[PDB]
Design an enzyme around this catalytic site. Sequence first.
Site, PDB file in Angstrom:
ATOM      1  N   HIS A  75      -7.297  -0.504  -6.651  1.00  0.00           N
ATOM      2  CA  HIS A  75      -6.173  -1.004  -7.444  1.00  0.00           C
ATOM      3  C   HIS A  75      -6.512  -2.424  -7.879  1.00  0.00           C
ATOM      4  CE1 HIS A  75      -5.028  -3.170  -3.877  1.00  0.00           C
ATOM      5  NE2 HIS A  75      -3.752  -3.345  -4.160  1.00  0.00           N
ATOM      6  N   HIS A  77      -5.026  -5.566  -7.556  1.00  0.00           N
ATOM      7  CA  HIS A  77      -4.902  -6.762  -6.732  1.00  0.00           C
ATOM      8  C   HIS A  77      -6.250  -7.319  -6.317  1.00  0.00           C
ATOM      9  CE1 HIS A  77      -0.532  -5.702  -5.381  1.00  0.00           C
ATOM     10  NE2 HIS A  77      -0.576  -6.327  -6.547  1.00  0.00           N
ATOM     11  N   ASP A  79      -7.418  -8.185  -3.514  1.00  0.00           N
ATOM     12  CA  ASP A  79      -8.098  -7.727  -2.317  1.00  0.00           C
ATOM     13  C   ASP A  79      -8.923  -6.481  -2.603  1.00  0.00           C
ATOM     14  OD1 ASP A  79      -5.728  -6.155  -2.542  1.00  0.00           O
ATOM     15  OD2 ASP A  79      -5.101  -6.390  -0.476  1.00  0.00           O
ATOM     16  N   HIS A 137       2.355   1.468  -3.723  1.00  0.00           N
ATOM     17  CA  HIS A 137       2.130   0.035  -3.541  1.00  0.00           C
ATOM     18  C   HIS A 137       2.009  -0.686  -4.880  1.00  0.00           C
ATOM     19  CE1 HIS A 137       0.293  -3.679  -2.185  1.00  0.00           C
ATOM     20  NE2 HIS A 137      -0.828  -3.378  -2.824  1.00  0.00           N
ATOM     21  N   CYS A 156      -4.288  -0.085  -0.158  1.00  0.00           N
ATOM     22  CA  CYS A 156      -3.029  -0.682   0.246  1.00  0.00           C
ATOM     23  C   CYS A 156      -1.859   0.258   0.089  1.00  0.00           C
ATOM     24  CB  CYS A 156      -2.771  -1.937  -0.535  1.00  0.00           C
ATOM     25  SG  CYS A 156      -4.156  -3.099  -0.527  1.00  0.00           S
ATOM     26  N   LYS A 159       0.197   2.548   4.551  1.00  0.00           N
ATOM     27  CA  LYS A 159       0.940   1.431   5.121  1.00  0.00           C
ATOM     28  C   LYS A 159       1.754   1.985   6.273  1.00  0.00           C
ATOM     29  CE  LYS A 159      -0.042  -2.249   2.588  1.00  0.00           C
ATOM     30  NZ  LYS A 159       0.511  -2.467   1.256  1.00  0.00           N
ATOM     31  N   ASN A 165       3.510  -6.172   0.743  1.00  0.00           N
ATOM     32  CA  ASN A 165       4.022  -6.860  -0.438  1.00  0.00           C
ATOM     33  C   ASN A 165       4.482  -5.854  -1.494  1.00  0.00           C
ATOM     34  OD1 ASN A 165       4.638  -8.334  -2.674  1.00  0.00           O
ATOM     35  ND2 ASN A 165       2.512  -8.814  -3.167  1.00  0.00           N
ATOM     36  N   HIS A 195      -5.104  -2.727   5.374  1.00  0.00           N
ATOM     37  CA  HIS A 195      -4.691  -3.851   6.214  1.00  0.00           C
ATOM     38  C   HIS A 195      -4.310  -3.455   7.635  1.00  0.00           C
ATOM     39  CE1 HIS A 195      -4.576  -6.089   2.443  1.00  0.00           C
ATOM     40  NE2 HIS A 195      -3.710  -5.217   1.958  1.00  0.00           N
TER      41      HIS A 195
HETATM   42  N1  LIG Z   1      -3.899  -9.160   0.311  1.00  0.00           N
HETATM   43  C1  LIG Z   1      -2.682  -8.569   0.800  1.00  0.00           C
HETATM   44  N2  LIG Z   1      -2.234  -7.352   0.507  1.00  0.00           N
HETATM   45  C2  LIG Z   1      -1.031  -7.035   1.035  1.00  0.00           C
HETATM   46  C3  LIG Z   1      -0.452  -5.659   0.774  1.00  0.00           C
HETATM   47  O1  LIG Z   1       0.776  -5.452   0.977  1.00  0.00           O
HETATM   48  O2  LIG Z   1      -1.220  -4.732   0.362  1.00  0.00           O
HETATM   49  C4  LIG Z   1      -0.443  -8.042   1.841  1.00  0.00           C
HETATM   50  C5  LIG Z   1       0.849  -8.068   2.655  1.00  0.00           C
HETATM   51  C6  LIG Z   1       0.505  -8.054   4.165  1.00  0.00           C
HETATM   52  C7  LIG Z   1       0.808  -6.731   4.884  1.00  0.00           C
HETATM   53  C8  LIG Z   1      -0.128  -5.706   4.886  1.00  0.00           C
HETATM   54  C9  LIG Z   1       0.138  -4.497   5.546  1.00  0.00           C
HETATM   55  C10 LIG Z   1       1.336  -4.302   6.202  1.00  0.00           C
HETATM   56  C11 LIG Z   1       2.288  -5.325   6.214  1.00  0.00           C
HETATM   57  C12 LIG Z   1       2.023  -6.532   5.561  1.00  0.00           C
HETATM   58  S1  LIG Z   1      -1.524  -9.337   1.796  1.00  0.00           S
HETATM   59 ZN   LIG Z   2      -2.302  -4.607  -3.335  1.00  0.00          ZN
HETATM   60 ZN   LIG Z   3      -3.261  -5.371  -0.037  1.00  0.00          ZN
END
Ligand SMILES: Nc1nc(C(=O)O)c(CCc2ccccc2)s1
Ligand SMILES: [Zn+2]
Ligand SMILES: [Zn+2]
Length: 219
Positions: A75, A77, A79, A137, A156, A159, A165, A195
């Site tokens: 995606h 973003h 990251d 996401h 991402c 989750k 986010n 993450h």
């Molecule tokens: N580079 C970043 N991506 C994200 C995202 O949401 O993909 C961030 C938020 C941090 C988070 C990540 C997982 C579960 C809960 C919180 S920071």
């Molecule tokens: Zn993202």
């Molecule tokens: Zn992310």
Amino acid sequence: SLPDLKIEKLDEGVYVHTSFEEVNGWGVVPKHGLVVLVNAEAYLIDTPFTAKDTEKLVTWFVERGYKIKGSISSHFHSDSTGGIEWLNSRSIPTYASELTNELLKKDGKVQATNSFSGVNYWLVKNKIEVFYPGPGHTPDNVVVWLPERKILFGGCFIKPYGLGNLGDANIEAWPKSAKLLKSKYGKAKLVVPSHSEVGDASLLKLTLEQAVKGLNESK
Ligand SMILES: Nc1nc(C(=O)O)c(CCc2ccccc2)s1
Ligand SMILES: [Zn+2]
Ligand SMILES: [Zn+2]
């Protein structure tokens, strides 16, 4: 002064790369992607946040005999895409969906040099598949499937313990998209989120639950 890029064998010919950012309000966030080996050739599944870390990562594998054939970004973003400019600068082919590149363009970012569209796309026939489950996401998010060892990179979108986010998220669609992904990939041995830690296919159910909960507790 955060942890350094880590590279760790996950399965045969599959490596997880983990880079790190300190984000205000979240603390230190790990970001996982993959390096997938096919013979003497390496494919990046998502890039680290930075050019610097994408350089480290590429060099790790070059110094071990692998050509970097390309990278795919799940995606738009940072990251998943932060390393595209450096990879382009090295003439390493970069792949993103047509939707991701249009979002990179609108976000004022450099785009991947190769684009694809559709529900299913073979980055490498019968070895590296890309699947679009639907918005979640982000509008553009895709997952990457390795049929060999039955490994799913969820980016991402996976989750399992909280959605993260929601700035660019579509909470209306996310449960729909997550049910679909659970249906298609229930037989994954390993599921790799962006993450949190690698787990098995239960991470697909946990994600569906978190998407439903976020829709419900949105009213
Ligand atoms: N580079 C970043 N991506 C994200 C995202 O949401 O993909 C961030 C938020 C941090 C988070 C990540 C997982 C579960 C809960 C919180 S920071
Ligand atoms: Zn993202
Ligand atoms: Zn992310």
